[PDB]
Enzyme design. Sequence first.
Site, mmCIF file in Angstrom:
data_model
loop_
_atom_site.group_PDB
_atom_site.id
_atom_site.type_symbol
_atom_site.label_atom_id
_atom_site.label_comp_id
_atom_site.label_asym_id
_atom_site.label_seq_id
_atom_site.Cartn_x
_atom_site.Cartn_y
_atom_site.Cartn_z
ATOM 1 N N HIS A 94 73.472 105.927 32.828
ATOM 2 C CA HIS A 94 72.782 106.108 34.116
ATOM 3 C C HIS A 94 71.449 105.334 34.212
ATOM 4 O O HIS A 94 70.570 105.444 33.351
ATOM 5 C CB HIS A 94 72.441 107.570 34.201
ATOM 6 C CG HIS A 94 72.705 108.211 35.519
ATOM 7 N ND1 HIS A 94 71.847 108.056 36.581
ATOM 8 C CD2 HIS A 94 73.747 108.950 35.979
ATOM 9 C CE1 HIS A 94 72.350 108.651 37.644
ATOM 10 N NE2 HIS A 94 73.507 109.201 37.307
ATOM 11 N N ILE A 100 62.878 102.268 33.191
ATOM 12 C CA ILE A 100 61.728 102.448 32.324
ATOM 13 C C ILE A 100 62.014 103.463 31.224
ATOM 14 O O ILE A 100 63.025 104.157 31.257
ATOM 15 C CB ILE A 100 60.523 102.912 33.180
ATOM 16 C CG1 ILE A 100 60.239 101.853 34.251
ATOM 17 C CG2 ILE A 100 59.297 103.152 32.312
ATOM 18 C CD1 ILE A 100 59.078 102.178 35.177
ATOM 19 N N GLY A 116 57.981 108.718 29.898
ATOM 20 C CA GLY A 116 56.851 109.083 29.067
ATOM 21 C C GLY A 116 57.209 110.114 28.008
ATOM 22 O O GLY A 116 56.818 109.980 26.849
ATOM 23 N N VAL A 117 57.968 111.136 28.389
ATOM 24 C CA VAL A 117 58.342 112.176 27.440
ATOM 25 C C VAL A 117 59.110 111.664 26.221
ATOM 26 O O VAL A 117 59.074 112.290 25.158
ATOM 27 C CB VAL A 117 59.166 113.311 28.119
ATOM 28 C CG1 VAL A 117 58.318 114.028 29.161
ATOM 29 C CG2 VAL A 117 60.421 112.740 28.736
ATOM 30 N N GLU A 166 58.551 111.642 22.131
ATOM 31 C CA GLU A 166 59.604 111.881 21.155
ATOM 32 C C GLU A 166 59.579 110.833 20.042
ATOM 33 O O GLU A 166 59.718 111.165 18.866
ATOM 34 C CB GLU A 166 60.976 111.888 21.855
ATOM 35 C CG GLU A 166 62.180 112.096 20.928
ATOM 36 C CD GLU A 166 62.217 113.470 20.278
ATOM 37 O OE1 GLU A 166 62.869 113.614 19.226
ATOM 38 O OE2 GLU A 166 61.610 114.419 20.810
#
Lengths: 134, 133
Positions: free
Chosen positions: A43, A49, A52-53, A57
Amino acid sequence: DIKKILPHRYPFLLVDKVIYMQPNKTIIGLKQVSTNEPFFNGHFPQKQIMPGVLQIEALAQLAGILCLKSNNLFLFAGVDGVRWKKPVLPGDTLTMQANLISFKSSLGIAKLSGVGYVNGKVVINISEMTFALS
Amino acid sequence: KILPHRYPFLLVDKVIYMQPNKTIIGLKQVSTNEPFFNGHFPQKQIMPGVLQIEALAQLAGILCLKSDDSNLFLFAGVDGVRWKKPVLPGDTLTMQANLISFKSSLGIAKLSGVGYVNGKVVINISEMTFALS
């Protein structure tokens, strides 16, 4: 990589390779973001991009590699002071560094700081990442 | 209905309550079919805390939207994140976000967030920062 012995609930290892490591102190790793990226699971965007999360990680896994190199399971328990400066795009080489702040087996808690760079520029800062018990 | 989401998947199934400039309650039915679940074959599927942050960030993002009468909010930072308990497929993650500040000059919005499963907190987030544009 020799890190499968490294735990992660997140499906993909976000560190292509560790290019520097100083036990009980610091670790530097890389990830060349491609247009491939299994993480946007089949997807994707017009402009894809790296969320951020997931930068968090990647830094956490790196930090996890450092702890591991210092019968010693570490779970990601908390994170504070994260700042996302610039977005991470395909074609970017994300250079990451994690510095060990403390490791009190007293309670079994480790704290690490982290920074992410792209072409010499900070894209993300993480004041503290907490790890522990199992 | 949908709006602005940098992480590709909307991690909020339903918004069950919302007070402009105050709070929002939403939830997510964690499926075994989740995109972030396929990518590896573990013995036990456990939702990554990082995506729990993202879930609360999208929820907060909605509150931000409905609180603005006129504007784009980019997830710029997060403080005091604590993961209390594991979230598994089949769990109903209930979430609540509360507006803390709307600093016009600094152009930033700040919200707190909490996640529960069966009335029991599974995640806490002291502060989520959103920037304009």
